[PDB]
Motif scaffolding. Sequence first.
Motif, PDB file in Angstrom:
ATOM      1  N   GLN A 409       0.816  -1.210   0.000  1.00 25.92           N
ATOM      2  CA  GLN A 409       0.000   0.000   0.000  1.00 25.92           C
ATOM      3  C   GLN A 409       0.854   1.265   0.000  1.00 25.92           C
ATOM      4  O   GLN A 409       0.333   2.376   0.102  1.00 25.92           O
ATOM      5  CB  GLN A 409      -0.944  -0.002   1.201  1.00 25.92           C
ATOM      6  N   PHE A 410       2.164   1.088  -0.117  1.00 30.64           N
ATOM      7  CA  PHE A 410       3.086   2.212  -0.235  1.00 30.64           C
ATOM      8  C   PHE A 410       3.837   2.131  -1.559  1.00 30.64           C
ATOM      9  O   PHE A 410       4.109   1.040  -2.059  1.00 30.64           O
ATOM     10  CB  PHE A 410       4.067   2.233   0.937  1.00 30.64           C
ATOM     11  N   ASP A 411       4.168   3.286  -2.125  1.00 33.92           N
ATOM     12  CA  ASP A 411       4.812   3.331  -3.432  1.00 33.92           C
ATOM     13  C   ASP A 411       6.329   3.440  -3.305  1.00 33.92           C
ATOM     14  O   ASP A 411       6.848   4.423  -2.777  1.00 33.92           O
ATOM     15  CB  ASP A 411       4.263   4.498  -4.255  1.00 33.92           C
ATOM     16  N   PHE A 412       7.031   2.424  -3.795  1.00 31.73           N
ATOM     17  CA  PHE A 412       8.488   2.385  -3.725  1.00 31.73           C
ATOM     18  C   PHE A 412       9.117   2.482  -5.111  1.00 31.73           C
ATOM     19  O   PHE A 412      10.334   2.376  -5.256  1.00 31.73           O
ATOM     20  CB  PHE A 412       8.960   1.102  -3.035  1.00 31.73           C
ATOM     21  N   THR A 413       8.279   2.679  -6.124  1.00 29.41           N
ATOM     22  CA  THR A 413       8.739   2.717  -7.510  1.00 29.41           C
ATOM     23  C   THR A 413       9.710   3.867  -7.767  1.00 29.41           C
ATOM     24  O   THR A 413      10.780   3.669  -8.342  1.00 29.41           O
ATOM     25  CB  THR A 413       7.556   2.835  -8.489  1.00 29.41           C
ATOM     26  N   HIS A 414       9.334   5.067  -7.339  1.00 26.25           N
ATOM     27  CA  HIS A 414      10.175   6.242  -7.538  1.00 26.25           C
ATOM     28  C   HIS A 414      10.647   6.808  -6.203  1.00 26.25           C
ATOM     29  O   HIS A 414       9.856   7.387  -5.460  1.00 26.25           O
ATOM     30  CB  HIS A 414       9.420   7.315  -8.322  1.00 26.25           C
ATOM     31  N   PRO A 415      11.942   6.634  -5.893  1.00 30.15           N
ATOM     32  CA  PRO A 415      12.535   7.148  -4.652  1.00 30.15           C
ATOM     33  C   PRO A 415      12.453   8.668  -4.550  1.00 30.15           C
ATOM     34  O   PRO A 415      13.299   9.366  -5.109  1.00 30.15           O
ATOM     35  CB  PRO A 415      13.996   6.692  -4.743  1.00 30.15           C
ATOM     36  N   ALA A 416      11.447   9.171  -3.843  1.00 26.48           N
ATOM     37  CA  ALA A 416      11.283  10.609  -3.664  1.00 26.48           C
ATOM     38  C   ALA A 416      12.324  11.161  -2.696  1.00 26.48           C
ATOM     39  O   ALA A 416      13.141  10.416  -2.155  1.00 26.48           O
ATOM     40  CB  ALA A 416       9.879  10.927  -3.172  1.00 26.48           C
ATOM     41  N   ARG A 417      12.294  12.473  -2.487  1.00 27.66           N
ATOM     42  CA  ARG A 417      13.192  13.113  -1.534  1.00 27.66           C
ATOM     43  C   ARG A 417      12.747  12.828  -0.105  1.00 27.66           C
ATOM     44  O   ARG A 417      13.510  12.295   0.701  1.00 27.66           O
ATOM     45  CB  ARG A 417      13.246  14.623  -1.774  1.00 27.66           C
ATOM     46  N   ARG A 418      11.506  13.192   0.200  1.00 31.02           N
ATOM     47  CA  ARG A 418      10.957  13.020   1.539  1.00 31.02           C
ATOM     48  C   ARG A 418       9.529  12.487   1.488  1.00 31.02           C
ATOM     49  O   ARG A 418       8.760  12.829   0.589  1.00 31.02           O
ATOM     50  CB  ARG A 418      11.000  14.344   2.306  1.00 31.02           C
ATOM     51  N   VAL A 419       9.186  11.645   2.456  1.00 30.09           N
ATOM     52  CA  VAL A 419       7.846  11.075   2.547  1.00 30.09           C
ATOM     53  C   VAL A 419       7.289  11.225   3.958  1.00 30.09           C
ATOM     54  O   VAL A 419       7.935  10.846   4.934  1.00 30.09           O
ATOM     55  CB  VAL A 419       7.837   9.583   2.151  1.00 30.09           C
ATOM     56  N   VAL A 420       6.089  11.787   4.060  1.00 27.89           N
ATOM     57  CA  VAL A 420       5.434  11.956   5.350  1.00 27.89           C
ATOM     58  C   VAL A 420       4.535  10.760   5.651  1.00 27.89           C
ATOM     59  O   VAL A 420       3.781  10.312   4.791  1.00 27.89           O
ATOM     60  CB  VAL A 420       4.599  13.250   5.392  1.00 27.89           C
ATOM     61  N   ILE A 421       4.629  10.235   6.868  1.00 30.89           N
ATOM     62  CA  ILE A 421       3.763   9.139   7.290  1.00 30.89           C
ATOM     63  C   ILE A 421       2.884   9.578   8.457  1.00 30.89           C
ATOM     64  O   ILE A 421       3.357   9.731   9.584  1.00 30.89           O
ATOM     65  CB  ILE A 421       4.572   7.891   7.687  1.00 30.89           C
ATOM     66  N   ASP A 422       1.602   9.784   8.175  1.00 28.46           N
ATOM     67  CA  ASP A 422       0.666  10.286   9.171  1.00 28.46           C
ATOM     68  C   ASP A 422      -0.013   9.149   9.930  1.00 28.46           C
ATOM     69  O   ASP A 422      -0.757   8.356   9.351  1.00 28.46           O
ATOM     70  CB  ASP A 422      -0.390  11.172   8.508  1.00 28.46           C
ATOM     71  N   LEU A 423       0.250   9.081  11.231  1.00 35.42           N
ATOM     72  CA  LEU A 423      -0.355   8.070  12.088  1.00 35.42           C
ATOM     73  C   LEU A 423      -1.361   8.703  13.042  1.00 35.42           C
ATOM     74  O   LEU A 423      -1.753   8.093  14.037  1.00 35.42           O
ATOM     75  CB  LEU A 423       0.719   7.326  12.883  1.00 35.42           C
ATOM     76  N   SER A 424      -1.771   9.931  12.732  1.00 36.95           N
ATOM     77  CA  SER A 424      -2.663  10.698  13.598  1.00 36.95           C
ATOM     78  C   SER A 424      -4.017  10.022  13.784  1.00 36.95           C
ATOM     79  O   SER A 424      -4.703  10.255  14.779  1.00 36.95           O
ATOM     80  CB  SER A 424      -2.867  12.107  13.037  1.00 36.95           C
ATOM     81  N   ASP A 425      -4.399   9.188  12.823  1.00 39.76           N
ATOM     82  CA  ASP A 425      -5.677   8.491  12.882  1.00 39.76           C
ATOM     83  C   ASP A 425      -5.487   6.979  12.959  1.00 39.76           C
ATOM     84  O   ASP A 425      -6.404   6.214  12.664  1.00 39.76           O
ATOM     85  CB  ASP A 425      -6.535   8.845  11.667  1.00 39.76           C
ATOM     86  N   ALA A 426      -4.293   6.554  13.361  1.00 39.68           N
ATOM     87  CA  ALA A 426      -3.974   5.133  13.440  1.00 39.68           C
ATOM     88  C   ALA A 426      -3.877   4.657  14.886  1.00 39.68           C
ATOM     89  O   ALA A 426      -3.730   5.462  15.807  1.00 39.68           O
ATOM     90  CB  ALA A 426      -2.677   4.842  12.703  1.00 39.68           C
ATOM     91  N   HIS A 427      -3.965   3.344  15.077  1.00 37.82           N
ATOM     92  CA  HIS A 427      -3.843   2.742  16.400  1.00 37.82           C
ATOM     93  C   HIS A 427      -3.076   1.426  16.327  1.00 37.82           C
ATOM     94  O   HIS A 427      -3.519   0.477  15.681  1.00 37.82           O
ATOM     95  CB  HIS A 427      -5.222   2.506  17.021  1.00 37.82           C
ATOM     96  N   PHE A 428      -1.926   1.372  16.990  1.00 32.17           N
ATOM     97  CA  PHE A 428      -1.115   0.158  17.009  1.00 32.17           C
ATOM     98  C   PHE A 428      -1.427  -0.661  18.256  1.00 32.17           C
ATOM     99  O   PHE A 428      -1.210  -0.200  19.375  1.00 32.17           O
ATOM    100  CB  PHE A 428       0.381   0.491  16.965  1.00 32.17           C
ATOM    101  N   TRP A 429      -1.934  -1.874  18.063  1.00 30.33           N
ATOM    102  CA  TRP A 429      -2.307  -2.729  19.184  1.00 30.33           C
ATOM    103  C   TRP A 429      -1.310  -3.864  19.385  1.00 30.33           C
ATOM    104  O   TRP A 429      -1.379  -4.595  20.370  1.00 30.33           O
ATOM    105  CB  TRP A 429      -3.710  -3.305  18.975  1.00 30.33           C
ATOM    106  N   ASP A 430      -0.379  -4.007  18.448  1.00 31.46           N
ATOM    107  CA  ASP A 430       0.572  -5.109  18.492  1.00 31.46           C
ATOM    108  C   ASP A 430       1.956  -4.669  18.024  1.00 31.46           C
ATOM    109  O   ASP A 430       2.091  -3.688  17.294  1.00 31.46           O
ATOM    110  CB  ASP A 430       0.068  -6.274  17.635  1.00 31.46           C
ATOM    111  N   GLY A 431       2.980  -5.404  18.449  1.00 28.79           N
ATOM    112  CA  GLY A 431       4.346  -5.119  18.047  1.00 28.79           C
ATOM    113  C   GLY A 431       4.578  -5.365  16.568  1.00 28.79           C
ATOM    114  O   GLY A 431       5.555  -4.882  15.995  1.00 28.79           O
TER     115      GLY A 431
END
Lengths: 467, 112
Positions: A409-431
Amino acid sequence: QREWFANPRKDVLAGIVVALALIPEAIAFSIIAGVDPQVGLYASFIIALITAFLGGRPGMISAATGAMALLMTGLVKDHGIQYLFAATVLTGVLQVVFGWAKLARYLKFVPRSVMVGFVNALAILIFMAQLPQFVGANWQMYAMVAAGLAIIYLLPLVFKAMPSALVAIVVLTVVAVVTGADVKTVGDMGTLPTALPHFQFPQVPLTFETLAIIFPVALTLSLVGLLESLLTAQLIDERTDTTSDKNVESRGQGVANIVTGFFGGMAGCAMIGQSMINVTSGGRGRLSTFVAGAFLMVLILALQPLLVQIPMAALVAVMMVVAISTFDWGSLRFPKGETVVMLATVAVTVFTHDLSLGVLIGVVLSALFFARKVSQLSQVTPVDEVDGTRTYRVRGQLFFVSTHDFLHQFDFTHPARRVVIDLSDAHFWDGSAVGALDKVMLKFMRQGTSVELRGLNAASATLVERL
Amino acid sequence: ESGGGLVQAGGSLRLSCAASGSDVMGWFRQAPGKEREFVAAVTRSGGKSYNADSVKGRFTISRDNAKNTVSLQMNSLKPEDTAVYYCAAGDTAITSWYGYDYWGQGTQVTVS
Ligand SMILES: CCCCCCCCCCO[C@@H]1O[C@H](CO)[C@@H](O[C@H]2O[C@H](CO)[C@@H](O)[C@H](O)[C@H]2O)[C@H](O)[C@H]1O
Ligand SMILES: CCCCCCCCCCO[C@@H]1O[C@H](CO)[C@@H](O[C@H]2O[C@H](CO)[C@@H](O)[C@H](O)[C@H]2O)[C@H](O)[C@H]1O
């Protein structure tokens, strides 16, 4: 009406055999659950009776098994052997409720991993329950339990259709009595029946606060009992032929457990092994189970003074082999999740000495994996700011997450300069959520693309590892 | 790991971590009595990773040309940055948390 009395000659005999096989089971299981043998023997008797009259599948022995005992062993040391009675009554109530609503067909939905885990945990818990008889150790204990295993495993290759456990118990009893061996006897662990079970209203529990403490164990006891009854039924179905209504069987089970609870008894269900020994020996009538319970009561009342003299090494040997018979499964060299469920139940039960907890975590784990098979619960949404910087908005609950699905679900085709990863609406329940995100970021950084993490601490706060 | 000390209201400080003992190297900060927090991490390839929650675009991580050194520039410090800064050298895994092969006992960083 369809009610018969066919083959009394074989039914009575079979009932006798499985009764002789039934006594030590009930006594031992009573001791294992920290209670008097009387409770187990009573349970076996009255359950066998009521199931003989109201059971669905004829020729199926329902008495007292470890599958029930190891679920009450925690209730008896925290509240008493009588909150047990309440729990058995309520258990029977839940079973007749389950039968009245006609819900047996749903028992198929119960994961095989949970069940096999329950079996394993059960058996090794039996084997562990045999251990406190070795902490105070006289060499007579060791010698007689070793000779017990020996005579149980080596004699039947020479003998016939009579239990090697019978010979084990009788011989070890005669020896211990005659030689005057210095070992713990069964009569010490609890009182044995000397009369008929009287109507004992659970005078010990009190209404609501009691309900709040016996409802879980009654639930687990009921479910386990209905599962056991179901599979035992079906096996007797395969062995012979029948259109047995498992709902009626569940109802009979329920009523049985109810009156059992009202007569100072334990909780009981169908017994695979003894049902098999029964049908193999010619038992296929209700009179088989009836005679099982009845002759059980008569015989334990007859041999009472001799019964209390039976050394604990014999019974600990019988339990030692019943455990072995129960555990051994297909230790496969297969779905990782299911194995995870089984081993989870096993390890948790082993560590905590609570079968109910193992069952619980089995249920919730199976439920989680189910939710992972059936739904999404989390999605990422790639958005472009006017800066031309890819910001991945991760939303939803993340537990047991697959790293592959996350990377895809992430694009690795073209190596950009910088990528932001927003976890503001995410919830981690497991390692595993952590690990997945880590694999993503490590891939980006190895690719030469820097990563900016956003709204993070809130997502990593829902971790179960926070206890 | 070296560079701990006292900092003023808007002061600055660079933290050089030395591995006396190899893809990626990280930096975490531990608030006294509070849960540990991620600061930054940098790979050999040249890719960086920041915590825009704890690092509001203020700090700057970089790997030295030396095989056993990683620097963390820290500017515009604030009362909540006051913590113990640990350097990690776990490689090929856990870029972001929970550590790997190597850790180094952290030094104290106090602002005013
Ligand atoms: C045009 C007609 C076509 C005919 C096709 C062939 C018919 C065969 C159907 C078998 O049905 C059986 O009926 C028995 C009673 O109706 C049931 O109880 C049977 O099984 C019980 C236990 O095995 C015994 O106690 C009973 O005596 C015994 O009758 C038994 O469950 C059931 O399987
Ligand atoms: C809410 C979810 C709760 C999940 C609980 C699952 C309970 C249902 C499992 C029933 O499976 C049977 O359990 C028996 C024991 O309970 C086993 O007999 C075992 O014990 C017999 C004697 O004790 C031996 O003869 C057998 O070989 C040995 O397998 C039997 O094999 C097994 O098929």
